[PDB]
Structure formats: structure tokens, C-alpha cells
Amino acid sequence: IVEGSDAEIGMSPWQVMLFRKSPQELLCGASLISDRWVLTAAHCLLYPPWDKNFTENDLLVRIGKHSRTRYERNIEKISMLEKIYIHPRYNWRENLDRDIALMKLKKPVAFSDYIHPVCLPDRETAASLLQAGYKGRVTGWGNLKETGQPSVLQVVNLPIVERPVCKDSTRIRITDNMFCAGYKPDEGKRGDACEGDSGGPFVMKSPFNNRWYQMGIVSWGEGCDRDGKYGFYTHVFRLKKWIQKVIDQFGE
């Protein structure tokens, strides 16, 4: 996260860390949606251009963290995966359209003051909060500058941008399964996600029922916090039926 600040303890209890077993490294961000399912970006697991294709056996999920490198004994929980499900129409060949994946944990995790799931939006919440000008929050342990890694979880609040502005800031073909966010060069406010933050959550707090909903997943950007560029996020609500389907077809 570029121009974000350190998170407070327990600020994003749904934040997950995809960790590689060997070499031991931070792979991506992710989110806890129930006691057995984690949501992340499909490019974090499968990206043929860079010969990236991870499997169950190659990853670990660390939940309840704050510090990026320390094993927070008695605070974090580490789980193994039972299954990984990538959206069948994930388009890695062109624009990372439908950049979403679900991971089923080997065993359910127990909640705590540091571990709690986030809510997935319903048509009405999506409709009222996903409007240009409304701010959302992104969290992650990713880089601090384009080219600078934090010790703790960072947070930045960003505005959703109008779709034409998003389409006119890039040469990539944007689809309805994406939305972009960030400040305009003109707003003298900065902030953005960056390498290492992929897969993490873009969340909003409902003023109707005070709950936090995950509206997007960090998907892609061109550099980090560049002026005139914005970050793109998977549109969770547009892919919710796929989510529901794998969950009640394969578990809960």
C-alpha cells in the first residue's frame, strides 16, 4: 500500500496472508468469509505467462496477523487447504477478467478478537454503496513504493471512480466484472495498493446496519500510485452466484 498508514490492532480481522511454504514468502492477500472459506484473486494462484500455477500443497493461509514477518504466537492461526477453485472463465490471456478464486481450508478456524469474517454484499448493499465518490478501504502487507515493505499491516481509504474515467486511463479493455478506485491527480490526496497486496479486500462499512462488506478484491494496476492511473478490483457482487454455487456444492 502506497501512502497508507499502519492499521490498528483488530481493524481488519478478515485479512488473510497467502504464504508459500518454500521459499517461505508472502504471496498475496486474501479474506475470510466463513470459518472454512477464504476468497482471493485467481492470478495469485494461476498465471501461465510467468509459469505460476500453485496447488493445495504449495500454500499455507495465515489468519489473525498484524506484523508482516513475525510468527505471532498465540494470536495467528495457520491453515492448510483442502481445495482451490478458480473461476472457470478467469481470463488470464487478456485482461484478468473474473479474477477470483475460493480456497477451502482443511479444518474450520475459530474466531477471536483478531479473526472474524467479513460479509459479502447483497444486491441492495452493492447498489447503494458502489457509487463514484464513495470511499472504500484496502489493506495489505505489499510494497510501500513502486520501487519499502512495511513491518505491520497498512491501510488506505480510496474513492470509487466513474467508469469512463477508469476506461480512459488505460489501454486495457475493462469489463463489468471490474471497477477502479483512487484519487484524481487533481485531488492532491494519494494512495494505492501495489505489489504484494493482490488478492486482498476492498471493503466498505454500511451506514444502514454498521457492518463491513467486501465489495472488491485487489486485481491489477499499472505501477503503484501513479498520477492519472487507478487500481482495478474484481466486482464481488457480480460474481456472487458463482461463489454461492461452489460453496453449497462443495461445503460451507
Partner: peptide
């Protein structure tokens, strides 16, 4: 940079 994690998770 990452601190070692306990062996029963590998």
C-alpha cells in the same frame, strides 16, 4: 526476513 514458523504446519 520472515521468522520461522512451527514445523507441524509444513
Amino acid at each position: 526476513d520472515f521468522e520461522e514458523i512451527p514445523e507441524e504446519y509444513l
